[PDB]
Amino acid sequence: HPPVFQKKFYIGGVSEDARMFASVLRVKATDRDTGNYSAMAYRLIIPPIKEGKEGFVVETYTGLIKTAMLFHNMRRSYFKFQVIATDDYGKGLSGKADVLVSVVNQLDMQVIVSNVPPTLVEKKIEDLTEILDRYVQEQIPGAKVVVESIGARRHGDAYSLEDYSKCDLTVYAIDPQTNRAIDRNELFKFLDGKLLDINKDFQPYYGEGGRILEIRTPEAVTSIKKRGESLGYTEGALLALAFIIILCCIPAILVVLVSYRQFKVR
Amino acid sequence: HPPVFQKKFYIGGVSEDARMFASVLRVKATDRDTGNYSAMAYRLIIPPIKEGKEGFVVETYTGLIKTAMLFHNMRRSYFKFQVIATDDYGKGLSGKADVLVSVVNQLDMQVIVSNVPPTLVEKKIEDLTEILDRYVQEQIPGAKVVVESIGARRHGDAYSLEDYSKCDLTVYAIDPQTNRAIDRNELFKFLDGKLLDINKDFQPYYGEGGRILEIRTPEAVTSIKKRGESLGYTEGALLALAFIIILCCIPAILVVLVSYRQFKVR
Amino acid sequence: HTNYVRNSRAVGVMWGTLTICFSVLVMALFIQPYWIGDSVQAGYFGLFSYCVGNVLSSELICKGGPLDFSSIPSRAFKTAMFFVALAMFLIIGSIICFSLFFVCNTATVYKICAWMQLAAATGLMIGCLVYPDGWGHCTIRWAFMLAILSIGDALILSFLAFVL
Amino acid sequence: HTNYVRNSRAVGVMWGTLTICFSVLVMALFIQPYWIGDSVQAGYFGLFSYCVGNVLSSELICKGGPLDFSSIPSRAFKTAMFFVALAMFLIIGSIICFSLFFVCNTATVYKICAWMQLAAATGLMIGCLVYPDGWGHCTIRWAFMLAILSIGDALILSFLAFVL
């Protein structure tokens, strides 16, 4: 007998400098009645990719989707494929579903900062993403917050300190219609407009004296100005040489004009 | 009743630019007879770290060790701590064990290259590391191959291509005595001396027509020469200006010497 | 007209000095790494070789150097390279017309080097006009501005050379 | 002695030109980014500010610039900075002794600028000797080699200034 999916279209998304076989998500095609879904073999049906890439993989008895490709300078290479789940340890019947996965850069990142330790954040990240994608999908049904990395709060000397009482949370939702990565400013504005409604909700999750603080910009956005180089001073020295020598030659022209003029006079 | 560990000292190790909450390893303190070890709560006892770091974490009902700290320029900050496992969903008795974890750079990496697709490698990585740490611990009991990243084979234009028939495998073993990271050349030589003995062994694992090919050096070692800048040509232009002007002033000295000498003569 | 012949031989050896100064200036204009760049791709290309990359990428590869007469994309870049290389060899020949100063007349050699600096200013003007036709954001580097100051430089050198 | 006075006024305006050339040379020696570096830490420090980092690290921070008389570590670096800054202001004063050329005697102003270039060569010699005492691998950059060529440069300028 075939399994029963939770969502008929599971929804994924990864990043550019993500490593090989990173955690995309875990799937669950449930058994219908008996709950004997440990005999399920989650497998794939994958459309062909250039150069023979397998690209997106999954395990068998965990359902955890992993990656089989690198992303040197690739961007928004959105991939749709099929996933199956075979009953009877890979012998019974099956149902199939599809997954979209996007590949995001540093510029498709906005940090959520709250006033809690980050290990509690990564502990309760399931319910955190659950409450987010509960109160965000009223924008668009088809949005799914994809957590990138959960660090301590970057601040200080060129954003190189860590606050442990606070946290960094790197997220992005899903484009279900044009099916690609999402720029950081709509990532700001779709979240920031309903901030207090979810500040209500994290009291069984943050605890007490806890709330969402701010929605700020990552660190490598600042480095974009830094890698752009400019006019130095050695260059300016050579330009100053040219300006010096034309500044020398002009009075030479005028004095030799007066010279040949007085040569004509006397 | 307390659990039963597999090894009384579990052994870990991470890298420098590893991300937050990365897969260190999974622990297993087994139930002794009944096999009812789903009521085990794997928890920690951690010595204090500077600035209030929690640093190394673990989950509860999976045993998977994760990270709670970043590594801007840190190196060989080896950490020993305690781990517990409480019976009865966190109410029974416990046994305790310890874990050493090192933090390695790009320079503590050597790539294993074989002639197999990388997804089969990451599939059978358990048995791969098992056969490695079977036939390597005859060097030192206390060595544990720590796989960093499994990519396709870097070659081509400045090592920027991928071979899918072949594979990259970034490993390192463990220092159990001086308890720190291991440089790449002993990582080469401890493996390369018994290559054919393990080329025998991967025939149920690679399949047929498969063996270990070579033990080569990662890509970022080459970039170390590239970041070292040198004398340009604008610099050389200014030096040439100085050399020109001394080359002009020396015959001026000699001609004005002859000038004042002939002034003395006539 | 004693002070006027003082001025004559003075500005003659000034031709020598300032000419070899702009010889190494134009040679520096050749063997630089920076011609025209951009900061929004993200590249610091240079029309003989070109390092082109993307955002925050560390490793860059410039494609060229000692030419094969086919390495750079635009033939307009090849032709302007030939103009400015003729300007290079011209100013080396102007060092040679300084070397041929003591044999012939001053009014001879001044007209020789005058014809030289005329052709130098003309060829540099043409190459500087050719580059934007070979060509989309840009950040222009110091090469073209050094060249456009060298325009008026060789213009003033040729004007005072016609004066002498 | 007509050709000899030709030589006299010729090399006088040569003092003007080559002096202002080394004025902008020493000003370039000041406002560079590279003093002494190293490639095995991994840093490109510069004794007024210092960008120090490690292997393959992208972001660097130079610590200094317009000084506070306390920013740089070594007082020997501060004192050698004061020597070479006196050399800077000296060569600016040598542009001023070129500006005071038309009032007094030639033999007066040549001895003035001779005393100048004497003190310039002496102070640059002292600062170049001081830097290795302030100081472990190194890769020396082009600053010290430009300075050590400027040593013999100002030496030759002062020698021919004593000649004139």
Residue numbers in the entry:
A (entry chain C), B (entry chain A): 1145 to 1410
C (entry chain D), D (entry chain B): 15 to 54, 58 to 152, 171 to 199
Task: Copy text from the publication.
We discovered that a construct containing domains EC11 to CR, named PCDH151EC hereafter, when coexpressed with full length LHFPL5 yielded a well behaved complex. Two-dimensional (2D) classification of the resulting particles showed distinct secondary structure features of the EC11-EL and TM domains, indicating that this strategy was promising to result in a higher resolution reconstruction. A 3D reconstruction at ~4.5 Å resolution displayed three layers of density: a top layer formed by the EC11-EL domain, well fitted with the previously described crystal structure; a middle layer formed by the β-strand region of LHFPL5 and the extended C-terminal helix of the EL domain; and a bottom layer formed by the TM domains of PCDH15 and LHFPL5. The resulting structure harbors an overall 2-fold symmetry, containing two copies of PCDH15 and LHFPL5. The density for the TM domain containing ten α-helices was well resolved, with some side chain features for bulky residues. Within the TM region there are extensive interactions between PCDH15 and LHFPL5. Each PCDH15 protomer makes more extensive interactions with one LHFPL5 protomer (1100 Å2 buried surface area, BSA) compared to the other (LHFPL5’, 270 Å2 BSA). We note that within the TM domains dimerization is primarily mediated by the interface of TM1 from LHFPL5 (487 Å2 BSA) together with the interaction of PCDH15 with TM1 of LHFPL5’. While there is a small interface of interactions between the 2-fold related PCDH15 TM helices (126 Å2 BSA), it likely is only a minor contributor to the stability of the complex. The extracellular domain of PCDH15 is situated ‘on top’ of the LHFPL5 β-sheet, but only minor direct interactions are apparent. While the crosslinking of the other residues is consistent with their close proximity in our model, the lack of a clearly defined periodicity indicates that the tip of the helices and the linker region are somewhat flexible.
